[PDB]
Structure 1
Amino acid sequence: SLLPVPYTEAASLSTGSTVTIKGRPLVCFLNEPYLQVDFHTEMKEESDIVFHFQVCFGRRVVMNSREYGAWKQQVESKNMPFQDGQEFELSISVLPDKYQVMVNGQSSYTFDHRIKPEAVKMVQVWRDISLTKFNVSYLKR
């Protein structure tokens, strides 16, 4: 809807930062839509990825990093709090030791830092969703 997808926004993250995304799947879970959020080290899409979050709605969630052009060890979770045909609010918080991902207010996934959050310069949100809101909190030093 409101925001274009793929959506790209230059960003800076540090401990205490929060990335909030509000959106909705474009098709029924039965047709398996995806959602992907990538934290890049450069403004270019072929750059390394500090945190890659991919949701196969109704199936699994996969998380990884791409360092020096190579994907590393994948982490998969079968935890699936997303609701079929519903709007969702995804919140990603930067803790000192890891990212904590909340879905509609409930802790659902965590991912220990492999590269310092300070290396992030861009965030891209894409795949089968409409995006109504995207916000990065620049509250802390």
Structure 2
Amino acid sequence: LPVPYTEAASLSTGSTVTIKGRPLAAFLNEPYLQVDFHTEMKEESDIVFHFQVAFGRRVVMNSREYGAWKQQVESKNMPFQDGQEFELSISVLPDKYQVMVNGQSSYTFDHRIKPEAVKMVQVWRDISLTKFNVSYL
């Protein structure tokens, strides 16, 4: 898939976003991955859920509300493996997003804005992408 990858989407409780891909560099070179749930089709729109992996180092999550970044949450959990593909699954729960990596629950992020505000998902920075799927149950 082309990266940056953009897909229109709608989310509610029970939605799952599944991303499958590979970093474009060895962890020694510190590639990044960014997944942004946007409120409008435009890249400059607000971000309900920002998920940013510094491969081999940390994860930060945040929201961008009326143009401004809010309270950053950091996690040093690093289930991604150097030089390997990954399967990333982001589930919408009533109270939070749950982020699974390779089948393992790894991060969560409480809703700051209703997920029904999402209109677009963008996946970008230093990855190649083989699948992107949004599914509802």
Given the two structures, how large is their TM-score scaled by the length of structure 1?
0.96
How far apart are the structure 2 equivalents of 1:32 and 1:87? 15
How far apart are the structure 1 equivalents of 2:25 and 2:77? 20
How far apart are the structure 2 equivalents of 1:59 and 1:68? 29
Q: For residues 62-121 of structure 1, what are the alpha-carbon distances to aligned partners after superposition, in whole Å with 9 as ceiling and x for unaligned?
A: 000000000000000000000000000000000000000000000000000000000000
Equivalent of 1:23, from 14, 17, 21? 21
Unaligned runs of 5+ in 2: none
How far apart are the structure 2 equivalents of 1:28 and 1:15? 36
Identity %: 98
Deviation at 1:33, TM superposition (A): 0.2
Where 1:84 maps in the other structure, the secondary structure is: coil
How far apart are the structure 2 equivalents of 1:138 and 1:105? 18
Where 2:136 maps in the other structure, the secondary structure is: coil
Q: For residues 16-52 of structure 1, what are the alpha-carbon distances to aligned partners after superposition, in whole Å with 9 as ceiling and x for unaligned?
A: 0000000000010000000000000000000000000
Deviation at 1:4, TM superposition (A): 0.1
Deviation at 1:138, TM superposition (A): 3.0
Q: Superposition RMSD on alpha carbons, in Å? A: 0.4
How far apart are the structure 1 equivalents of 2:129 and 2:54? 17
Give the total of aligned pairs: 137
List structure 1 runs of 4+ shifted beyond 3 angstroms: none
Where 2:3 maps in the other structure, the secondary structure is: coil
Deviation at 1:124, TM superposition (A): 0.1
Where 2:116 maps in the other structure, the secondary structure is: helix
Deviation at 1:126, TM superposition (A): 0.1
How far apart are the structure 2 equivalents of 1:117 and 1:27? 32
How far apart are the structure 1 equivalents of 2:14 and 2:65? 24
Unaligned runs of 5+ in 1: none
Given the two structures, how large is their TM-score scaled by the length of structure 2?
0.99
